[PDB]
Design a protein around this ligand. Structure first.
Ligand code: HEM
Ligand code: HEM
Lengths: 203, 201
């Protein structure tokens, strides 16, 4: 990923807010030199992505994790809101399209996590916390978790580098920008909100 | 990606339909044993993903493409609708959460494309065709596209293998499935529509 200056994160906390808000991530590694990816829920331990630790799990029948000893460099991609920008919105002739989006790329070394039960219980709490009501596992469900454990492989990524893209049209002048934002406000309110947050000076 | 049989595509054209409906893809390669990914619009040439050809473009100032020159294997991930499934929706105890989603992974050899104008113009046509209304490039915009070409790098992927995941709660019993579909109907209609199409014929 390459990040033009206009699409850099405005504030250092924005990468971590995106990661926490979008836990269904893409875990990418090199299996015999070719890329392989698994969609998995991944949570963040720590205040910042860079230097932080990611915790995830996948199916033990998914052979992807068997590579995590011989090829330990991994990339985890977290994806926020996104949307196509049609030249129709600009209302200018000569124009060209683009796609607006925010994403965080965390690269580091992967390792298997012995305490798989901890990883999945922490994932439950993190993903249920924004919901009302939140689901809290009963004793019967924690016992069920224990019965399920042979089928899971948990893992940790110690994040060495992070890269964040907030490609949200901030290069546009106000008239073309207003038109982009108004088009997303109707059909993609999450993206419009991200655009609003990208313009903040402090909060 | 590992695809359990009950989350496989029900019809062989469903993978191609997902690719065409979700063209903003993730293009992944190995730049010195480390995975590097770029988000880019990618379209499908052919009736099927496997054996088909993917066409995309990225920023020439994005150094990612410089690793394509040796024609390494690339992975292109197309992601459809997705949504978290909270056990609250099941309304049954012993339970555990999951995440429902559909995605297509295409792996093959990447080639730099000399015909970058054709790639970007075909991408325009493919992305605009279902919008209402569709944008129709004017002669001025076609001349603009030519002027922009130095700044773009286009590429082809010959798809050697493909995996398609339609993880859409097909394994739930009838009462729990209905709860999940009903819950997504309200807050994620694109995902609910995908579940409907997964059970049809
Ligand atoms: C907290 C939210 C959770 C989410 C969003 C989630 C999601 C997922 C996903 C997407 C997969 C597929 C991974 C792959 O393709 O390799 C998976 C696999 C698996 N997860 Fe989780 N999971 C959650 C919690 C749990 C808990 C608490 C357990 C208890 C041990 C668990 C046990 C498993 C097992 C056994 C599998 C293997 C496939 C299966 O049996 O369904 N998960 N999970
Ligand atoms: C059809 C829908 C299109 C979409 C969704 C789209 C989207 C994008 C995206 C996401 C990037 C950044 C890639 C990166 O990070 O490396 C990009 C770069 C670029 N695209 Fe496209 N594009 C489209 C059509 C076109 C057309 C017709 C042209 C005409 C030549 C063009 C020219 C460029 C150029 C010059 C760049 C690099 C410089 C820049 O980003 O402004 N694109 N495009």
């Amino acid at each position: 990923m390459f990040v033009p200056s206009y699409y850099a994160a405005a504030r250092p906390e924005q990468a971590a807010e995106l990661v926490r808000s979008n836990p269904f991530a893409l875990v990418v590694s090199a299996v015999d030199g070719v890329p392989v990816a698994t969609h998995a829920p991944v949570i963040l331990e720590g205040d910042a992505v860079e230097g932080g630790t990611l915790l995830g799990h996948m199916n033990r029948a998914n052979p992807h994790w068997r590579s995590f000893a011989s090829s330990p460099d991994v990339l985890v991609v977290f994806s926020g809101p996104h949307g196509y920008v049609s030249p129709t919105v600009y209302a200018t002739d000569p124009a060209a399209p683009t796609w607006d989006y925010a994403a965080v790329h965390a690269t580091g070394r992967v390792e298997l996590a012995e305490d798989a039960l901890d990883v999945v219980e922490r994932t439950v709490a993190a993903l249920e916390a924004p919901r009302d009501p939140a689901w809290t596992p009963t004793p019967a469900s924690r016992e069920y978790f224990r019965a399920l454990l042979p089928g899971v492989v948990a893992f940790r990524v110690r994040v060495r580098t992070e890269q964040s893209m907030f490609k949200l049209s901030q290069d546009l002048d106000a008239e073309r920008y207003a038109r982009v934002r108004e088009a997303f406000a109707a059909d993609n309110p999450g993206l419009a909100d991200l655009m609003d947050r990208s313009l903040e000076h402090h909060h």
